[PDB]
Amino acid sequence: MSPILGYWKIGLVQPTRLLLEYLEEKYEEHLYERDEGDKWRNKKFELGLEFPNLPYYIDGDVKLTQSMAIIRYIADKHNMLGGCPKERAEISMLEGAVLDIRYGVSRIAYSKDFETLKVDFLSKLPEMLKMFEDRLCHKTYLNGDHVTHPDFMLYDALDVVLYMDPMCLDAFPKLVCFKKRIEAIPQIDKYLKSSKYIAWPLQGWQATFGGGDHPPKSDLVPRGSPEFMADGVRAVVADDSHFMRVISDILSDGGIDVVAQARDGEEAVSAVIEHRPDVVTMDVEMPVMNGIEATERIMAESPTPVLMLSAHTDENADVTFEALDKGAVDFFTKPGGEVSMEMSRLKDQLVEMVSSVAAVDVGATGSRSGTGSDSGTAPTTAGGSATDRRGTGGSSGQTTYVANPTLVGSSTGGPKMVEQVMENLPIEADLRVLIIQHMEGFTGRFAERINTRSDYEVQEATDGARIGGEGLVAAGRHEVKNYRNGRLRTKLTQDEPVNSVRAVDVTMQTAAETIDDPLVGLILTGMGEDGADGIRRIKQAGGKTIQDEATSAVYGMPKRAAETGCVDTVLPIDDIADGVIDTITTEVT
C-alpha cells in the first residue's frame, strides 16, 4: 500500500482544527477586556472555519477557506517545524496574515459591493428622472390644457435626490446586498448539505494546491470523520517523567496515537515492538540503560525510525548526533517550560514530523539490513582522487586544472544519508561543500565528525572562515561573496527567510551569478522545494545539479527531483565522492 502516505497525513487533524481554540480562547477575550457597560455590543465575531462534519463556515468567502488549503500541502510535505526553532517565524504570525487578510481584505469587497450596488441604484436613478420628466408632459396633451406644468413639479426630486444621505445613498444600496443575501445563503448552504460530495474534492485536496506557511485554521473537517480508515499512525511515549509525554495528550485528538508509555529505556524496547506503531518518540537519559543505546538495543532487532527528542545542553549535540549513526532520521528539537499558548504549535513540530518520519514503508530499514552487512568506513575515490592517490604527482599524468572548489544541502536525511557523502572529501582536492540543514551548537558537533573521522578537516562557520582546504558547512542567520581578487569566502545571511525557511535556497541561488562553471550544486535528503527553484538556474545554464530512493527514507526534497529535468539523472547514496570529484575533472581543466 502506497496511498497510505496520504493516509499517513489527513495526524494532520491537529494542524487543522487547532485555532478554533484560538477563537473561543481569543474572542472570549474581546469580552471581559470590556466592562459592565460594554455588555451588549460584542459577539458577532464569526467563528470562521470550514465544517463538512457540522454546520459552520466563513461568512461568504469559501475562497479564503480554500486559499488556506492552497497552503498546508507544502507546509507539511516540506516540514517547516521539525527542524529549527527559527524556521517557524513568518508562520505563526502569518496565520494572522490570511486571518487578517480576510480580516483586512474582506471590506475591499464589502465597501466595494455597496459601491457596485450604489452605481446601479444611481445608474437607473438617471432613468427615474428620465422616467419622471417624460411622465409629467402627456396629460398636458390629454387634459384640456390643465397646466400645473412638469418642470416646477420636477426640482422637488433633484432637491431630494441629493438631500439623500448614506442611509439612502450608501446604506439603501447596503440594505439590499445582504437583503439579497437572504436570497443567497440558501444555495451557499445547499452545496454541502444536500450533497456529501464536498469532501470528495476536499479529501482529494490533500494532494494538490501550493502556498507555504501555517494558516490552516480548520479546513480538513472537524475532529471526527470516519474516513480515517484502516490503520492510523501510532507513536510510543518515552520521556523522563510523567507530565513530559498535555505532552501525552499531544496525539490524542484524532490522528497520531500513543500505544506505549514508559519512563524506562528498557520498558520501552519491551513496548514499542509490542503493538507496533511506526515511531518511538524518545529522549536522552533513561533509567537503567540510556536513550543513546535504547535505540540500537532496539535497532539490532527492529530498526524503527526513532524520533530523538533532545533538549540539547550543547553536549546533547552527540546524543542527538551519535544516535543518528545508531538509527535516527529526523530529531525533535525538544523544549520544556512555560505552558501557555504554543503547545498548539509545539505539537505540529512533533506530529507533522511523524507525518514525515513515519512516512516510511520498510525501505530505509531494508536498505543495508536485509542480511548481516555493516557498511563500515570509506572506500577510495576511484574515479577521481584515488587515481591521484595512486600515481605520479609529477608532470607526467598532471592536469591543466584549476583550484576552484565546487560548492554543495539537506535536512531530514542529513544525519546519515548526507554524512556518508562528506566522509570522502580528500585533502589533496581543494573543495567546499554546502550543508545548510535542520539543526544551536549542532553546527559544532555535526561537522566535528567529518573533521576527525574523514581524513580532511571541516569546520564550523564563523565570521568568515574563507575557503579550498576545508569546508563551508554550518547553517549558522547564515552570503559568500567575491572581493576583487578571484575566489570566495564564507559570509552570512539573516533577513526575513528566503522561501519562509531559516534558507537553503539563497546560498544556491547566489552562486549562479558569483563563481560559475567550476561550481556544482547538489540535492540530497530534506523535504523543502528550495533546491528546486534555486539551482534551477545553475542547470538552466551551466552548473551540475545532483537523490534516488533505495538509500534514504522519506522523499519530499527529492519528491520533485524529476518534474523539472534540470537534474542530470538519478543518484542514490554510497560512494558519492567518486563522482562528485569527477565533476571537478573536465570543467576545471
Curated annotation (Swiss-Prot):
Main localization, broad class: cytoplasm
GO molecular function, one term: protein-glutamate methylesterase activity
Record's catalysed reaction(s): [protein]-L-glutamate 5-O-methyl ester + H2O = L-glutamyl-[protein] + methanol + H(+); L-glutaminyl-[protein] + H2O = L-glutamyl-[protein] + NH4(+)
Low complexity: bias regions: 365-386
EC number assigned by the record: 3.1.1.61, 3.5.1.44
Positions of the catalytic residues: S411, H438, D530
Region (Disordered): 363-405
Record-linked InterPro entries: CheB-like (IPR008248), CheB_C (IPR035909), CheY-like_superfamily (IPR011006), Sig_transdc_resp-reg_Me-estase (IPR000673), Sig_transdc_resp-reg_receiver (IPR001789)
Family annotation (SMART domains): REC (SM00448)
PROSITE patterns according to UniProt: CHEB (PS50122), RESPONSE_REGULATORY (PS50110)
One of the record's GO cellular component terms: cytoplasm
Domain of life: Archaea
Stretches that traverse the bilayer: none
Residues carrying 4-aspartylphosphate: D283
Residue stretches in coiled coil: none
PTM per Swiss-Prot/TrEMBL: Phosphorylated by CheA. Phosphorylation of the N-terminal regulatory domain activates the methylesterase activity.
Positions of the Response regulatory domain: 234-349
Localization annotation: Cytoplasm
GO biological process, one term: chemotaxis
All residue ranges annotated as the CheB-type methylesterase domain in the record: 400-587
Pfam family, one: Response_reg
Function: Involved in chemotaxis. Part of a chemotaxis signal transduction system that modulates chemotaxis in response to various stimuli. Catalyzes the demethylation of specific methylglutamate residues introduced into the chemoreceptors (methyl-accepting chemotaxis proteins or MCP) by CheR. Also mediates the irreversible deamidation of specific glutamine residues to glutamic acid.
Family: Belongs to the CheB family.
Entry comment, domain topic: Contains a C-terminal catalytic domain, and an N-terminal region which modulates catalytic activity.
The protein's name: Protein-glutamate methylesterase/protein-glutamine glutaminase
Lineage: Archaea, Methanobacteriati, Methanobacteriota, Stenosarchaea group, Halobacteria
